[PDB]
Design a protein. Structure first.
Lengths: 455, 48, 469
């Protein structure tokens, strides 16, 4: 039997059972096809498609069918590189068949395209790892895929304001799927800022009235990537609400698979430090299934240092954790934004025993310098610290006023300061929260985040 | 190994209060805090 | 065009290393077939700049023709005759070099499937043709003449101008572009001869250093010479920033800082490509640090630095720059299009402590001086929010030590610029500060300034020593 003629019959009628680049699914059929297609030249393969009786009269669809015959004829299963031109050519031809919303068989093709997208992404990473041997630039393959998926994303149009039916076309059903695949790629090629256009144009293209109408797994991953994108731009609160909702939604998933535990862990790796910057600390109970005891112990040490105002302990903790923190883009933001929460707690204790207990309204700078001496410890100027570091070069006990000024400007300390009297005055009261309000409320009121529920 | 340590979510076949209400009220005597209170005592005693 | 077709790597050891698509294709009926070599897909074309030195090669006719232009420059005493005859020769030269395949035809920019590896062959610091042109156009700097009263540009002193799109509608010829070792030679000449002519030569040097970097990009060259030239040019920019501000000579900090930034971007790209190839660049850490100071509030650069190797990240210079980015951060920094972020330090006091460290590299300090006014504004803005309504004005002595103003006149002019009322001639009534942004809407920024301690350090060294490290 002429299996090429059989294949084209299937493709012409939207039966794509065998239209796949995955030989672990397609192998025996492709092998038979390769044997039978051997001997026919490119123009002959093209003609087989052009003249096939039921073939949709669509240029891009025939290009795609022909591209697959070429692939089947010339594929070398022993060499992923040698076969790659056929594989990536066909994939591009396949996605091109989705650009027109009224393309032939587009609805049957949507599942094919997602299936093949997962295949080609994996193959692209494989080949990109050999870029030096292949004389290609870093991420050239996977970046080519991002461009293809980007053109597809741009072709998805929003619903007509007065649509005649509720039908969710395939391109809309995979809108968030595509957003996440594309943004994941941009993160993997180490260009996360390319997510900007994707994030910006996601909601305008969506036909669904509520973000919660998408699959919950796609929601969670979206919030995960959006939270990371925010955190890359140091927008801590904007990131927090996404990580926090991402974990909440995940807790609402049945833990059918281990990958869900590990995905929850991925969220917590960012939700914990993000919340800490905002003055929030987790209850480990609901987190036990997703974190090892050691990771809990580790974040609990940092919790202790921040909670009680030990700047030196925070810096030591960041120093010890530097490598993996850099890998998750967490070191700088924590280095920068943990201090003032730690300072707040430092002077919180000071004001508690000094004002609330001992009834002293005035804070002499000399006192706070002594407190900072204990909290900061060593500095770039001090002996034994010949070389400047991000851990000894930022915080100094000498800059009492500066610390207090920023605490007051962030709204974490309600106080007046007298530079020529070298003291700051708090309100004479027994209620500590009147002088040092709850951190999270203050920060979140100064930096209101966008609606945690996107829409 | 790479799929389990990478920050990218893993694929899986598709089918509550987690935050301390407040940590300013829940006060636990800490080592660093003990030395801080001691420094407040020493400062209070050395200064009128 | 019909350049020779390019084919995919069919090397055997490569194929074996990359591996197969499936484990046992024969089990599924596949037979090892001798597939004919197929051409390289468009998306796998590699236009990555050259990373390694290549032997200098010059076409024999090109060499003889440039020697002829030199001989005519020496023999034709008339100024306009030289330029007219050299213009004729250039017309002949273009079509000739086109036919040789050594310059893209000016007919149309062609697909990058067929790109020419362009090699510059100008062995002077300025092409002979340009010298004769700028002679006619009276755009020869005094620095480019053997004698001051000369009208002809000197072959030994003239420096190629940055090519502007207004001119050069057609691609530059090899004779227009200096090869890497001549670009090094040219920068060597600047460092040895022209640094001391600053500040007066700022427009000259700025333009000529732009041209050096441009010639490298004409040749798509990211080799060692391009790194070295961009590195030392960055340093010259940093030196210029201080010299121009100290002297009070009117200049465009904007244009200096733009090209400084663009040069750092170039360096970051080369450092990346070199890392991808397994090489290394010894000065990378220094210029990653400078890059961290070019956009001191842009989180993108904190992102990029956190993914570099440990030895780069932990380099004292990168550590110093990171400290500065941290003390400078401010949750109240205000500017159209800047998003404020949480819990920033606004450690202005620490900033001025670090600016005074003798461990601060001087050229880094020069870069950080760009932010003196901004940091000072937000220091006073923050401090004023802590003062009660009836608090006395803050004496100048206090703010001068706190913000390290150079003298009383500077803090007076500062308060005047931001309409901070001055009481008793020696005090600042901070409550009268009504601005919440360092950038005033309807007036130009306050002039850039400097720190006395960094000027004093500069006077203790040489410009040349600073540029060479």
């Amino acid at each position: 039997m002429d299996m090429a003629n059989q294949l084209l019959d299937e493709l012409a009628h939207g039966n794509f059972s065998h239209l796949t680049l995955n030989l672990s699914q397609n192998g025996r059929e492709i092998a038979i096809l390769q044997k039978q297609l051997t001997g026919f030249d490119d123009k002959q393969l093209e003609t087989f498609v052009e003249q096939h009786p039921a073939m949709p009269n669509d240029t891009r669809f025939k290009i795609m069918c022909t591209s697959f015959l070429n692939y089947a004829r010339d594929v070398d299963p022993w060499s992923a590189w040698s076969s790659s031109d056929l594989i990536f050519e066909f994939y591009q031809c396949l996605i091109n068949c989705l650009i027109n919303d009224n393309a032939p068989h587009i609805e049957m093709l949507i599942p094919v395209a997602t299936r093949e997208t997962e295949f080609i992404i994996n193959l692209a990473g494989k080949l990109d790892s050999f870029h030096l041997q292949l004389h290609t630039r870093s991420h050239q393959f996977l970046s080519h895929i991002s461009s293809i998926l980007s053109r597809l994303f741009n072709s998805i149009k929003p619903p007509r304001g007065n649509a005649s039916s509720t039908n969710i076309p395939g391109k809309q059903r995979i809108l968030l799927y595509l957003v996440n695949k594309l943004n994941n790629i941009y993160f993997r090629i180490e260009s996360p800022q390319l997510c900007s256009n994707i994030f910006k144009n996601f909601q305008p293209k969506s036909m669904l009235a509520h973000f919660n109408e998408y699959q919950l797994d796609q929601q969670i991953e979206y919030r995960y990537l959006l939270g990371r994108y925010y955190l890359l731009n140091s927008q801590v609160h904007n990131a927090f609400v996404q990580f926090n909702e991402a974990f909440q939604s995940l807790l609402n998933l049945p833990l059918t698979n281990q990958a869900i535990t590990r995905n929850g862990t991925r969220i917590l790796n960012y939700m914990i430090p993000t919340g800490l910057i905002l003055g929030k600390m987790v209850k480990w109970g609901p987190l036990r299934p997703f974190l090892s005891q050691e990771t809990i112990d580790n974040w609990s040490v940092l919790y202790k240092h921040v909670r009680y105002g030990n700047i030196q302990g925070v810096s030591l903790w960041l120093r010890q954790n530097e490598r993996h923190l850099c890998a998750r883009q967490l070191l700088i933001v924590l280095l920068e934004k943990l201090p003032m929460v730690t300072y707040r707690n430092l002077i919180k204790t000071v004001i508690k025993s000094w004002t609330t207990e001992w009834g002293q309204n005035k804070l002499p700078y000399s006192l706070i310098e002594r407190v900072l001496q204990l909290s900061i410890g060593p500095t770039f100027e001090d002996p034994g610290a010949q070389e400047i570091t991000i851990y000894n070069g930022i915080h100094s006990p000498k800059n009492v006023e500066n610390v207090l000024v920023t605490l007051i400007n962030l709204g974490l300390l309600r106080a007046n300061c007298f530079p020529q009297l070298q003291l700051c005055v708090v309100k004479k009261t027994t209620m500590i929260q009147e002088i040092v309000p709850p951190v999270n409320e203050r920060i979140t009121k100064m930096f209101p985040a966008h609606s945690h529920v996107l829409w | 190994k790479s799929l389990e340590e990478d920050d990218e979510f893993e694929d899986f076949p598709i089918d509550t209060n987690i935050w301390e209400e407040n940590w300013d009220d829940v006060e636990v005597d800490d080592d660093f805090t003990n030395e801080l209170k001691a420094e407040l005592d020493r400062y209070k005693r050395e200064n009128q | 065009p019909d350049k020779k077709k390019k084919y995919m790597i069919n090397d055997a050891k490569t194929i074996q290393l990359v591996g197969p698509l499936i484990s046992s294709p024969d089990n599924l009926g596949f037979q090892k077939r001798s597939h004919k070599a197929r051409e390289l897909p468009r998306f796998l074309i590699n236009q990555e700049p050259q990373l390694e030195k290549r032997a200098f090669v010059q076409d024999p006719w090109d060499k003889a023709n440039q020697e002829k232009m030199i001989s005519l420059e020496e023999s034709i005493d008339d100024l306009n005759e030289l330029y007219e005859t050299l213009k004729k020769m250039r017309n002949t030269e273009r079509s000739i070099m086109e036919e040789k395949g050594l310059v893209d035809k000016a007919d149309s920019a062609k697909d990058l499937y067929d790109a020419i590896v362009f090699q510059g062959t100008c062995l002077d610091m300025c092409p002979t043709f340009e010298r004769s042109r700028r002679n006619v156009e009276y755009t020869v700097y005094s620095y480019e003449k053997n004698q001051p009263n000369d009208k002809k540009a000197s072959r030994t002193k003239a420096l190629k101008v940055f090519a502007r799109p207004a001119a050069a509608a057609a691609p530059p010829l090899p004779s227009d572009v200096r090869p890497p070792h001549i670009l090094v030679k040219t920068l060597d000449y600047i460092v040895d001869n022209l640094l001391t002519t600053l500040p007066e030569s700022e427009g000259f040097l700025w333009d000529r250093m732009r041209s050096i970097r441009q010639d490298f990009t004409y040749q798509n060259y990211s080799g060692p010479e391009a790194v070295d030239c961009n590195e030392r040019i960055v340093r010259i920019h940093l030196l210029i920033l201080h010299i121009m501000v100290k002297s009070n000579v009117e200049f465009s900090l904007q244009q200096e800082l733009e090209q400084l930034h663009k040069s750092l971007i170039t360096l970051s790209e080369i450092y990346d490509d070199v890392r991808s190839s397994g090489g290394t660049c010894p000065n990378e850490a220094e210029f990653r640090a400078y890059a961290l100071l070019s956009k001191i509030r842009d989180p993108q650069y904190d992102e990029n630095i956190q993914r570099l190797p440990k030895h780069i990240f932990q380099d004292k210079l990168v550590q110093m720059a990171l400290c500065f980015r941290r003390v400078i951060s401010n949750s109240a920094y205000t500017e159209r299009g800047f998003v404020k972020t949480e819990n920033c330090l606004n450690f202005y006091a620490r900033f001025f402590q670090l600016m005074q460290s003798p461990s601060l590299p001087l050229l880094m300090g020069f870069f950080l001086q760009m932010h003196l006014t901004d940091i000072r504004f937000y220091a006073l803005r923050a401090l004023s929010h802590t003062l009660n309504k009836k608090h006395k004005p803050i004496p100048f002595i206090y703010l001068e030590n706190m913000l390290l103003f150079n003298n009383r006149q500077e803090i007076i002019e500062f308060c005047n610029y931001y309409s901070i009322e001055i009481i008793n001639g020696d005090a600042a009534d901070l409550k009268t500060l009504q601005h919440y942004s360092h950038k005033l809407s309807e007036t130009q920024p306050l002039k850039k300034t400097y720190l006395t301690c960094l000027e004093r350090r500069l006077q203790k060294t040489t410009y040349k020593g600073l540029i060479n490290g």
